[PDB]
Protein backbone atom coordinates (compact mmCIF):
# COMPACT_ATOMS: atom_id res chain seq x y z
CA UNK A 1 0.00 0.00 0.00
CA UNK A 2 0.97 3.65 -0.40
CA UNK A 3 2.36 6.03 2.18
CA UNK A 4 2.74 9.79 1.88
CA UNK A 5 4.90 12.51 3.38
CA UNK A 6 4.73 16.20 2.54
CA UNK A 7 6.79 19.31 3.22
CA UNK A 8 4.56 22.32 2.66
CA UNK A 9 5.75 25.92 2.31
CA UNK A 10 9.40 24.99 1.82
CA UNK A 11 11.73 27.97 1.38
CA UNK A 12 12.96 27.32 -2.16
CA UNK A 13 11.74 27.91 -5.69
CA UNK A 14 9.88 25.14 -7.47
CA UNK A 15 12.13 25.10 -10.54
CA UNK A 16 15.35 24.53 -8.59
CA UNK A 17 13.90 21.68 -6.53
CA UNK A 18 12.54 19.91 -9.62
CA UNK A 19 16.08 19.21 -10.83
CA UNK A 20 16.82 17.02 -7.80
CA UNK A 21 13.46 15.25 -7.87
CA UNK A 22 14.20 13.83 -11.33
CA UNK A 23 17.11 11.66 -10.19
CA UNK A 24 15.18 9.48 -7.76
CA UNK A 25 11.96 8.87 -9.70
CA UNK A 26 11.30 5.13 -9.82
CA UNK A 27 14.36 3.92 -7.91
CA UNK A 28 14.68 1.70 -4.88
CA UNK A 29 14.75 3.38 -1.48
CA UNK A 30 18.32 2.36 -0.61
CA UNK A 31 19.71 3.65 -3.91
CA UNK A 32 17.74 6.88 -3.58
CA UNK A 33 19.13 7.47 -0.10
CA UNK A 34 22.62 6.84 -1.46
CA UNK A 35 22.26 9.24 -4.40
CA UNK A 36 20.90 12.21 -2.46
CA UNK A 37 23.76 11.94 0.04
CA UNK A 38 26.46 12.59 -2.57
CA UNK A 39 24.79 15.42 -4.51
CA UNK A 40 25.86 19.00 -3.82
CA UNK A 41 22.65 21.00 -3.81
CA UNK A 42 20.63 22.83 -1.19
CA UNK A 43 17.50 21.03 -2.37
CA UNK A 44 19.01 17.59 -1.74
CA UNK A 45 18.75 18.12 2.02
CA UNK A 46 15.03 18.89 1.95
CA UNK A 47 14.19 15.97 -0.33
CA UNK A 48 16.25 13.56 1.76
CA UNK A 49 14.50 14.65 4.95
CA UNK A 50 11.10 14.20 3.31
CA UNK A 51 12.04 10.77 1.97
CA UNK A 52 13.34 9.56 5.33
CA UNK A 53 10.15 10.77 7.00
CA UNK A 54 8.10 8.90 4.40
CA UNK A 55 10.12 5.76 5.13
CA UNK A 56 9.42 6.09 8.85
CA UNK A 57 5.66 6.33 8.25
CA UNK A 58 5.46 3.20 6.10
CA UNK A 59 6.95 1.16 8.96
CA UNK A 60 5.24 2.47 12.10
CA UNK A 61 1.71 3.18 10.86
CA UNK A 62 1.44 0.68 7.99
CA UNK A 63 3.21 -2.67 7.69
CA UNK A 64 6.92 -3.32 7.47
CA UNK A 65 9.76 -4.69 5.31
CA UNK A 66 11.46 -1.45 4.31
CA UNK A 67 13.77 -3.64 2.23
CA UNK A 68 11.52 -3.67 -0.85
CA UNK A 69 9.99 -0.19 -0.94
CA UNK A 70 10.27 1.98 -4.05
CA UNK A 71 9.69 5.61 -4.99
CA UNK A 72 6.50 5.41 -7.03
CA UNK A 73 5.53 9.08 -7.33
CA UNK A 74 7.22 12.38 -6.55
CA UNK A 75 6.28 15.88 -7.66
CA UNK A 76 6.76 19.53 -6.74
CA UNK A 77 4.39 22.48 -6.98
CA UNK A 78 4.36 26.14 -6.07
CA UNK A 79 3.19 27.77 -2.88
CA UNK A 80 2.38 31.33 -1.84
CA UNK A 81 4.93 34.01 -2.69
CA UNK A 82 6.12 36.74 -0.34
CA UNK A 83 6.63 40.16 -1.91
CA UNK A 84 9.36 42.61 -0.89
CA UNK A 85 10.73 45.87 -2.26
CA UNK A 86 14.26 46.64 -3.44
CA UNK A 87 15.46 50.14 -4.36
CA UNK A 88 17.13 51.04 -7.64
CA UNK A 89 18.82 54.06 -9.18
CA UNK A 90 17.20 57.49 -9.58
CA UNK A 91 14.38 56.87 -7.12
CA UNK A 92 12.85 53.87 -8.88
CA UNK A 93 11.73 50.83 -6.89
CA UNK A 94 11.23 47.20 -7.88
CA UNK A 95 9.24 44.16 -6.82
CA UNK A 96 10.89 41.05 -5.40
CA UNK A 97 9.32 37.59 -5.20
CA UNK A 98 10.45 35.01 -2.64
CA UNK A 99 9.02 31.74 -3.91
CA UNK A 100 8.19 28.61 -1.94
CA UNK A 101 7.25 25.03 -2.82
CA UNK A 102 5.27 21.96 -1.77
CA UNK A 103 7.05 18.59 -1.73
CA UNK A 104 5.31 15.21 -1.85
CA UNK A 105 6.82 11.73 -1.99
CA UNK A 106 4.86 8.51 -2.47
CA UNK A 107 6.56 5.29 -1.37
CA UNK A 108 5.05 1.84 -1.79
CA UNK A 109 6.01 -1.83 -1.68
CA UNK A 110 4.86 -2.34 -5.28
Amino acid sequence: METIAKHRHARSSAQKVRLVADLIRGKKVSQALDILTYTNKKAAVLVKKVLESAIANAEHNDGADIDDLKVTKIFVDEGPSMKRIMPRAKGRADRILKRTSHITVVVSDR
Binding site: M82, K83, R84, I85, K90, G91, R92, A93, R95
Partner: protein, 39 residues
Protein backbone atom coordinates in the same frame (compact mmCIF):
# COMPACT_ATOMS: atom_id res chain seq x y z
CA UNK B 1 2.92 34.66 17.30
CA UNK B 2 5.41 35.97 14.65
CA UNK B 3 5.79 33.90 11.52
CA UNK B 4 2.74 34.08 9.26
CA UNK B 5 1.50 37.36 10.74
CA UNK B 6 4.50 39.63 10.14
CA UNK B 7 5.62 37.69 7.07
CA UNK B 8 2.33 38.51 5.36
CA UNK B 9 2.30 41.92 7.08
CA UNK B 10 5.24 43.25 5.07
CA UNK B 11 3.44 42.52 1.78
CA UNK B 12 0.86 45.16 2.68
CA UNK B 13 3.50 47.83 3.32
CA UNK B 14 5.37 47.10 0.08
CA UNK B 15 2.27 48.05 -1.93
CA UNK B 16 2.08 51.55 -0.45
CA UNK B 17 5.86 51.95 -0.64
CA UNK B 18 5.89 51.21 -4.38
CA UNK B 19 2.81 53.44 -4.63
CA UNK B 20 4.77 56.38 -3.18
CA UNK B 21 7.95 55.58 -5.13
CA UNK B 22 6.22 57.01 -8.24
CA UNK B 23 6.49 60.76 -7.59
CA UNK B 24 7.47 60.94 -11.29
CA UNK B 25 8.89 64.46 -11.17
CA UNK B 26 12.37 62.96 -11.50
CA UNK B 27 11.44 61.93 -15.02
CA UNK B 28 14.28 64.07 -16.43
CA UNK B 29 13.49 63.89 -20.12
CA UNK B 30 14.29 66.42 -22.83
CA UNK B 31 16.30 63.45 -24.18
CA UNK B 32 19.40 65.62 -23.96
CA UNK B 33 20.84 64.51 -27.28
CA UNK B 34 19.94 66.57 -30.37
CA UNK B 35 16.42 66.33 -31.75
CA UNK B 36 15.65 63.41 -34.06
CA UNK B 37 14.78 65.49 -37.14
CA UNK B 38 15.50 69.01 -35.93
CA UNK B 39 15.03 72.22 -37.97
Amino acid sequence: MTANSRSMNLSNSVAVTVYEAWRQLGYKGSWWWPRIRGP
